[PDB]
PDB file of C-alpha atoms and ligand atoms in Angstrom:
ATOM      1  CA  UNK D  12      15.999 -52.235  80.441  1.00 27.57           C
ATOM      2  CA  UNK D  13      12.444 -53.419  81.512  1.00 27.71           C
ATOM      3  CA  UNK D  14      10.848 -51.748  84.808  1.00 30.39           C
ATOM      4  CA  UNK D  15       8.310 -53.999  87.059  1.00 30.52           C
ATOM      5  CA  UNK D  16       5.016 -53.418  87.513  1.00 29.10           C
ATOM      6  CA  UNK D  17       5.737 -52.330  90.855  1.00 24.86           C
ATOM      7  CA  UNK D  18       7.891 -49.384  89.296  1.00 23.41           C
ATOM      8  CA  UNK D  19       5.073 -48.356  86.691  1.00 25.02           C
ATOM      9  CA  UNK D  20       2.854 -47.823  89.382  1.00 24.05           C
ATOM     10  CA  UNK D  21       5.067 -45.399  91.340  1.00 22.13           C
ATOM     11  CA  UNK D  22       5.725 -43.559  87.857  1.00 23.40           C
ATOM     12  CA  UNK D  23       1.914 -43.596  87.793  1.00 23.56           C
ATOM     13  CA  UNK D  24       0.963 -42.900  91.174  1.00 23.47           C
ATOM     14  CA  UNK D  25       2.697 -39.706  90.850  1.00 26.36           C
ATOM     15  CA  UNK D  26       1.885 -38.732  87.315  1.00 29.52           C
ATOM     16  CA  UNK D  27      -1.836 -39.052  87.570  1.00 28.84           C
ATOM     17  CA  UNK D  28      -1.454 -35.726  90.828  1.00 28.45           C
ATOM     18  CA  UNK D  29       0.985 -33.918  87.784  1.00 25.70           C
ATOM     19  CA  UNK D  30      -2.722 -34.470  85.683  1.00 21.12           C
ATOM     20  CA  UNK D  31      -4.807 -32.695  88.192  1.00 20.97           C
ATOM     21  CA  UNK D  32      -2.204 -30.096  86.853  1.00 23.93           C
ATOM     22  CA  UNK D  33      -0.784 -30.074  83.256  1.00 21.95           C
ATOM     23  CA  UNK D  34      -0.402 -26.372  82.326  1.00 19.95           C
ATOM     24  CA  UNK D  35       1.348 -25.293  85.687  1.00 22.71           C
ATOM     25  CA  UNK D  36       3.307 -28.491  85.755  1.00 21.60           C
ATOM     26  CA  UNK D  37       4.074 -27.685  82.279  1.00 22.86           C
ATOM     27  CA  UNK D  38       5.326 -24.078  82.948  1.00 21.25           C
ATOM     28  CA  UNK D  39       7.702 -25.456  86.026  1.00 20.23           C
ATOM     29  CA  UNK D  40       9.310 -28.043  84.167  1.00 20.82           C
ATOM     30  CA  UNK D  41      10.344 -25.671  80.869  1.00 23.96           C
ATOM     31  CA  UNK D  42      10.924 -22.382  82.923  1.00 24.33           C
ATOM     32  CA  UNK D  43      13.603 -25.055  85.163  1.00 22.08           C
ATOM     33  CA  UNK D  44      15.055 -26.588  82.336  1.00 20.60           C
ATOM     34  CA  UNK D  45      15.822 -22.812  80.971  1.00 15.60           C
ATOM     35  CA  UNK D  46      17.161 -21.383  83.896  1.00 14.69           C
ATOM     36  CA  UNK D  47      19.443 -24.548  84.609  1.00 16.12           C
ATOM     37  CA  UNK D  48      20.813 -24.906  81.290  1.00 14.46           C
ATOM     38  CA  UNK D  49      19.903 -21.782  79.253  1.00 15.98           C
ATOM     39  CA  UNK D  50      21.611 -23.194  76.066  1.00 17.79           C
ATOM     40  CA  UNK D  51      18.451 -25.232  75.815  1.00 19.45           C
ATOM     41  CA  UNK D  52      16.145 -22.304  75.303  1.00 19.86           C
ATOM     42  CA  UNK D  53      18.336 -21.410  72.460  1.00 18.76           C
ATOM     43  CA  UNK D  54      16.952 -24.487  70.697  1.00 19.78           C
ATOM     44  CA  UNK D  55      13.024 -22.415  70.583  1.00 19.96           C
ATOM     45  CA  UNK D  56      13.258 -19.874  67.639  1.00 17.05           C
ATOM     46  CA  UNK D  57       9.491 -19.215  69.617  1.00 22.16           C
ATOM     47  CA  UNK D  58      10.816 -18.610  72.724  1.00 25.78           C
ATOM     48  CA  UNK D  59      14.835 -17.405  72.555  1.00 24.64           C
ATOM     49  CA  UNK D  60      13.622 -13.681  72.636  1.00 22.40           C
ATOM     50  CA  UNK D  61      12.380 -14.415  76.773  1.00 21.80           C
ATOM     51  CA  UNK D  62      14.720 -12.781  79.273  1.00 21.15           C
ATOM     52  CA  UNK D  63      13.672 -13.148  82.763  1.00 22.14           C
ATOM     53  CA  UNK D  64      11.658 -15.954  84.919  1.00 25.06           C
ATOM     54  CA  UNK D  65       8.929 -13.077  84.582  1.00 23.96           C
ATOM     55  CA  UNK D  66       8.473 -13.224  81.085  1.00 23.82           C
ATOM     56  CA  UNK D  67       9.044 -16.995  80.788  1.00 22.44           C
ATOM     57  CA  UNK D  68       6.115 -16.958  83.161  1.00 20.80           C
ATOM     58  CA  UNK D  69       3.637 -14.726  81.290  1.00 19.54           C
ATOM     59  CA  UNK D  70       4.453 -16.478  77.765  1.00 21.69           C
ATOM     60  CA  UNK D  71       1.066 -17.941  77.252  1.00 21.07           C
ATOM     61  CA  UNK D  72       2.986 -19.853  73.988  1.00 21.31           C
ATOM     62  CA  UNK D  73       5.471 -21.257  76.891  1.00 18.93           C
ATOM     63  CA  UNK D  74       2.727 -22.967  78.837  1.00 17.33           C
ATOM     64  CA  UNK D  75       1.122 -24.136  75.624  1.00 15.39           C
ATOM     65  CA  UNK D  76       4.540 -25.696  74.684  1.00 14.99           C
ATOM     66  CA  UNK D  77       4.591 -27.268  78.056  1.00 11.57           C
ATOM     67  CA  UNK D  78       1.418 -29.010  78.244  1.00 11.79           C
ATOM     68  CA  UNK D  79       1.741 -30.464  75.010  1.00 11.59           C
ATOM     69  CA  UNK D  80       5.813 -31.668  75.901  1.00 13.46           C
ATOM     70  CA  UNK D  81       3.937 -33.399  79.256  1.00  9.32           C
ATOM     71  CA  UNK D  82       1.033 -34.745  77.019  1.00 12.09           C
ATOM     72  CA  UNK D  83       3.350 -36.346  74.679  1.00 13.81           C
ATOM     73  CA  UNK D  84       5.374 -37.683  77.953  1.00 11.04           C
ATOM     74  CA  UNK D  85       2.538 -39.043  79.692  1.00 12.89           C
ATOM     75  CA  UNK D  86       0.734 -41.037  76.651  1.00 12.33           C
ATOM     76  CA  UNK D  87       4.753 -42.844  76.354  1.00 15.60           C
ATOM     77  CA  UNK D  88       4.584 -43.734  80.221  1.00 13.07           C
ATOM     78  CA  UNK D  89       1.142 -44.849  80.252  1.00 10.27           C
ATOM     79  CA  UNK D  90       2.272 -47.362  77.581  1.00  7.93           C
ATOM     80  CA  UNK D  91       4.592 -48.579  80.351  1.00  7.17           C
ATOM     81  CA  UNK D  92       7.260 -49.814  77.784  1.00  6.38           C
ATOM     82  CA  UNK D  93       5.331 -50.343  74.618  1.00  8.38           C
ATOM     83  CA  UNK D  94       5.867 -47.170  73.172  1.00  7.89           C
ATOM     84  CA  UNK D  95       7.213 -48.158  69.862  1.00  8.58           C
ATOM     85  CA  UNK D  96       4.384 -46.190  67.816  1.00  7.92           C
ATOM     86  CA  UNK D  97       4.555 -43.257  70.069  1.00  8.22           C
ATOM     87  CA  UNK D  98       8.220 -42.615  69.966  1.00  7.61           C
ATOM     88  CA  UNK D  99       8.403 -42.693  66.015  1.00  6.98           C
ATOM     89  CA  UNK D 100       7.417 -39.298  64.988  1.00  9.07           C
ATOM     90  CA  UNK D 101       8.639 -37.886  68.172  1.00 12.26           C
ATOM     91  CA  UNK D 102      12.252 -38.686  67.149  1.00 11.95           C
ATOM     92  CA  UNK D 103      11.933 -37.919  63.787  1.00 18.41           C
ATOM     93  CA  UNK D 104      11.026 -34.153  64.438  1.00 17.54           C
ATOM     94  CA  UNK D 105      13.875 -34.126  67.621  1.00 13.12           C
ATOM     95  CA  UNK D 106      16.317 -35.421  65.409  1.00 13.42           C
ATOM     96  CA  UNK D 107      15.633 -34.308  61.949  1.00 13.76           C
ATOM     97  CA  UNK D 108      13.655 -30.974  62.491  1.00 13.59           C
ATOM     98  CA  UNK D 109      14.509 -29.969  65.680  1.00 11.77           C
ATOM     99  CA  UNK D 110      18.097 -31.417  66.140  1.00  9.41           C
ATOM    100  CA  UNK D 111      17.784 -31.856  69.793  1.00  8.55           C
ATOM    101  CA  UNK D 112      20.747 -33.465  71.336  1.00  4.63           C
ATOM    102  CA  UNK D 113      20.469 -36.916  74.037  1.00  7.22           C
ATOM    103  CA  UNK D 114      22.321 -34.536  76.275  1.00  8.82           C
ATOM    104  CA  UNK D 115      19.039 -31.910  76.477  1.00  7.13           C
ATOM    105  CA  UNK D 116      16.550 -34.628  76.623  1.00 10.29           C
ATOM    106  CA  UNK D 117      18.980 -35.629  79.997  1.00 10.21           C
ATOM    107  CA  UNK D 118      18.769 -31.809  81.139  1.00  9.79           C
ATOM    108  CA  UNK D 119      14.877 -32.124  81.107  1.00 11.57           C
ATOM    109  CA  UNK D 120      14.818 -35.561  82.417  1.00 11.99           C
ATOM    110  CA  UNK D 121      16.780 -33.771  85.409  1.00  9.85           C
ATOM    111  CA  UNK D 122      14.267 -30.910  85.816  1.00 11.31           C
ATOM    112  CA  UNK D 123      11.154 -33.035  85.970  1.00 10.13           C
ATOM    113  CA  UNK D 124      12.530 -34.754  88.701  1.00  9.28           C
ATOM    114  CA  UNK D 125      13.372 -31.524  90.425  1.00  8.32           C
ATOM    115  CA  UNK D 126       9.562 -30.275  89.820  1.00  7.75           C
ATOM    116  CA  UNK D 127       7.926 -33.465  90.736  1.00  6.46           C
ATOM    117  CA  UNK D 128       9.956 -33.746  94.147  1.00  7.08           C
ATOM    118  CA  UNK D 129       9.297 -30.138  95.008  1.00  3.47           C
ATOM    119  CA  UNK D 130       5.687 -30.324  94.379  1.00  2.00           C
ATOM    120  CA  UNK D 131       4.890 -33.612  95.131  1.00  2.00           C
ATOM    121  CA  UNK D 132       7.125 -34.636  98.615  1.00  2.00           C
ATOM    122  CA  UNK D 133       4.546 -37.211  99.926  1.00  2.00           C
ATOM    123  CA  UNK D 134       4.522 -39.750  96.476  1.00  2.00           C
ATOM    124  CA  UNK D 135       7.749 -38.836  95.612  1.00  4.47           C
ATOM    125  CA  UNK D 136      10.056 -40.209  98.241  1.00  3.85           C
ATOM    126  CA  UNK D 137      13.256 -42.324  97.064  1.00  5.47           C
ATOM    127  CA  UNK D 138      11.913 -45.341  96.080  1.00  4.84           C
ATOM    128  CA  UNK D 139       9.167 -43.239  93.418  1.00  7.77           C
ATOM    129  CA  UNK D 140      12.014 -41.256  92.264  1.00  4.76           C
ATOM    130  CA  UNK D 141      14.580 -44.280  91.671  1.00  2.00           C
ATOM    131  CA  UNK D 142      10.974 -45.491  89.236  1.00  2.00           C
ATOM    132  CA  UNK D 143      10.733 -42.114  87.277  1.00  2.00           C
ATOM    133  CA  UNK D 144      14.676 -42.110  86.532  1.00  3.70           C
ATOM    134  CA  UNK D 145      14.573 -45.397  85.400  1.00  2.00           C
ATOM    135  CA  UNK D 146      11.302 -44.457  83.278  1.00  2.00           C
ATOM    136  CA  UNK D 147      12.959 -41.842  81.944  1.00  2.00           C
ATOM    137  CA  UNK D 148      16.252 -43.591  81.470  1.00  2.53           C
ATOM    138  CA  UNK D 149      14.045 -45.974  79.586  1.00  2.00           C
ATOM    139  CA  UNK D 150      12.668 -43.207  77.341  1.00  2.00           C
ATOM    140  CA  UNK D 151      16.605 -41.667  76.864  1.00  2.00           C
ATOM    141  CA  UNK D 152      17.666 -45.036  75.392  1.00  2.00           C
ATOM    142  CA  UNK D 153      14.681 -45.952  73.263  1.00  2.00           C
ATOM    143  CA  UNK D 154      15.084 -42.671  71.831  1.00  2.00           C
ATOM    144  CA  UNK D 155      18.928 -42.927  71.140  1.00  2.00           C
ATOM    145  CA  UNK D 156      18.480 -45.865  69.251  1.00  2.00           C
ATOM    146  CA  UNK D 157      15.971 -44.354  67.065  1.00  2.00           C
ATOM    147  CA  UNK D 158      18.279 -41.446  66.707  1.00  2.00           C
ATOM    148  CA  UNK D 159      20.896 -43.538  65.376  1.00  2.00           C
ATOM    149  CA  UNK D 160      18.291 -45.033  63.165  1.00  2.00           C
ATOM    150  CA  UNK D 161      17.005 -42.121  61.596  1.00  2.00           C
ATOM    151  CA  UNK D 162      20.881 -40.871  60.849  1.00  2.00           C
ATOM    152  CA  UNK D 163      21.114 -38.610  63.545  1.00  2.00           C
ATOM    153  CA  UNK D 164      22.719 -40.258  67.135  1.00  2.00           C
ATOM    154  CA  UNK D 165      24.065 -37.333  68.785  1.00  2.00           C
TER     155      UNK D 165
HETATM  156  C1  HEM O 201      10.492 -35.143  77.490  1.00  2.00           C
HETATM  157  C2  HEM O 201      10.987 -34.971  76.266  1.00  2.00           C
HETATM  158  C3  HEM O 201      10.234 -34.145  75.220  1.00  2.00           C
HETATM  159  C4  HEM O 201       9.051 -34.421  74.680  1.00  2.00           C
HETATM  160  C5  HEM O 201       8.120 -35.576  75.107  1.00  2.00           C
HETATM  161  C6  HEM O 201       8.834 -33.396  73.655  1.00  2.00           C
HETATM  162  C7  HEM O 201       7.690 -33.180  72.936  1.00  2.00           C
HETATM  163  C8  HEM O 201       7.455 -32.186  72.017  1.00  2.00           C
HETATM  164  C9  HEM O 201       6.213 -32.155  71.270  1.00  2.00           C
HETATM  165  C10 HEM O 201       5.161 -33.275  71.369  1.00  2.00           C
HETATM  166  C11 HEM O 201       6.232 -31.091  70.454  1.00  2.00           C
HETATM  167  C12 HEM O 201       5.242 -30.887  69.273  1.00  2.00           C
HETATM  168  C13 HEM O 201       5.435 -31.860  68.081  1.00  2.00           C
HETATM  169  C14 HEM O 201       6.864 -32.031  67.662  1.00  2.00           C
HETATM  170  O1  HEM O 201       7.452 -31.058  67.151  1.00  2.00           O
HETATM  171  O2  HEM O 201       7.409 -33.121  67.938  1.00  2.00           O
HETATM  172  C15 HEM O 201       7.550 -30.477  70.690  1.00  2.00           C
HETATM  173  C16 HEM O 201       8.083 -29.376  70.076  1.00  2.00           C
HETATM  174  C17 HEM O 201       9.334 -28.896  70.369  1.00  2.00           C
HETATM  175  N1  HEM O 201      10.268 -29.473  71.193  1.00  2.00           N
HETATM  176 FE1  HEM O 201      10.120 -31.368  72.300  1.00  2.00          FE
HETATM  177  N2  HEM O 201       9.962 -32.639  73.507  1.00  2.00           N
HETATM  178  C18 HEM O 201      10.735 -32.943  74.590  1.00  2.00           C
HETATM  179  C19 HEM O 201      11.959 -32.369  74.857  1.00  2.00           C
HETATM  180  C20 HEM O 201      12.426 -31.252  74.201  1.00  2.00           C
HETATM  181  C21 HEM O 201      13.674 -30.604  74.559  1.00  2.00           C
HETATM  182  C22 HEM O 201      14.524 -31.095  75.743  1.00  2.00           C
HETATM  183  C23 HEM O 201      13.851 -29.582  73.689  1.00  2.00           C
HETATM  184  C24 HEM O 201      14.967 -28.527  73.565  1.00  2.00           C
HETATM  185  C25 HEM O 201      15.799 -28.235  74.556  1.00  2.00           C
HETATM  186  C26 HEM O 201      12.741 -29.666  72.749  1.00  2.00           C
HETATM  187  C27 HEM O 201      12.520 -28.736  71.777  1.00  2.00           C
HETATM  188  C28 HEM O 201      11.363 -28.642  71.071  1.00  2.00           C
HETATM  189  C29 HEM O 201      11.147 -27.571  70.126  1.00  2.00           C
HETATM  190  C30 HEM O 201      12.128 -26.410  69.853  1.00  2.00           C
HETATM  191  C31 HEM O 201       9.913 -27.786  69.654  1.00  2.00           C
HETATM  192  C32 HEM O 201       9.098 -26.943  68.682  1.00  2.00           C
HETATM  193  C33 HEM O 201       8.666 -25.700  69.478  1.00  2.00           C
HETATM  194  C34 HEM O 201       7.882 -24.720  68.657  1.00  2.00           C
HETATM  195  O3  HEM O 201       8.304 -24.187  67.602  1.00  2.00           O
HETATM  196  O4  HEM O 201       6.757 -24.580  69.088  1.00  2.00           O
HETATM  197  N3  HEM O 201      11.814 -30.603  73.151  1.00  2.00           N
HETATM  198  N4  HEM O 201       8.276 -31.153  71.648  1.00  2.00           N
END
């Protein structure tokens, strides 16, 4: 799939208010993603010992976690489709090290939508959001096929 330039710039409209905001944005996205689908945070030997929201949200390893999962994100979508070089290592420690199924990276893809329209109503109206999903569709399948690749496609 290829997104137009138009698209980009909603995806980086948006992204450049969650930058005024990394860490916090960082913390909502995870703490969503584990409360949603709780088999995820199974997949942190740091973090499976967290029980409540509470915790989650006075982990000071969670929000480091999280700002470096939205650092790695952003550098991909600033690329705006040339992320080749970027995506390499990131699959090989998903797939190989981590063993992190398509289906979670679709559970987060689902939570950062859910953050970004909470927090962000007035740039992230229908047609921004239609932009991200396709972004992160984009992201989904690049990965996949390096998944399949590196001997891993699940
Ligand atoms: C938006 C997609 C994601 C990005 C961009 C991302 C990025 C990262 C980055 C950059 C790191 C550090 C370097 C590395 O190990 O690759 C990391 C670690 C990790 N990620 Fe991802 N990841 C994402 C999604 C996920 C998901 C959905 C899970 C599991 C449900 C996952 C599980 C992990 C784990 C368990 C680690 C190591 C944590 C630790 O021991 O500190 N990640 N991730």
């Amino acid at each position: 799939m290829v997104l137009s330039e138009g698209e980009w710039q909603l995806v980086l409209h948006v992204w450049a208010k969650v930058e005024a905001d990394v860490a916090g944005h960082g913390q909502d996205i995870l703490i969503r993603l584990f409360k949603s689908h709780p088999e995820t945070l199974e997949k942190f030997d740091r973090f499976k010992h967290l029980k409540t929201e509470a915790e989650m949200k006075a982990s000071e390893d969670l929000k480091k976690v999280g700002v470096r999962v939205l650092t790695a994100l952003g550098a991909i979508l600033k690329k705006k489709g040339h992320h080749e070089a970027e995506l390499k290592p990131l699959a090989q420690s998903h797939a190989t090290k981590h063993k992190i199924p398509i289906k979670y990276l679709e559970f987060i893809s689902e939570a950062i939508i859910h953050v970004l329209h909470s927090r962000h109503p007035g740039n992230f109206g229908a047609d921004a959001q239609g932009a991200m999903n396709k972004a992160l569709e984009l992201f989904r399948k690049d990965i996949a096929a390096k998944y399949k690749e590196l001997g891993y496609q699940g």
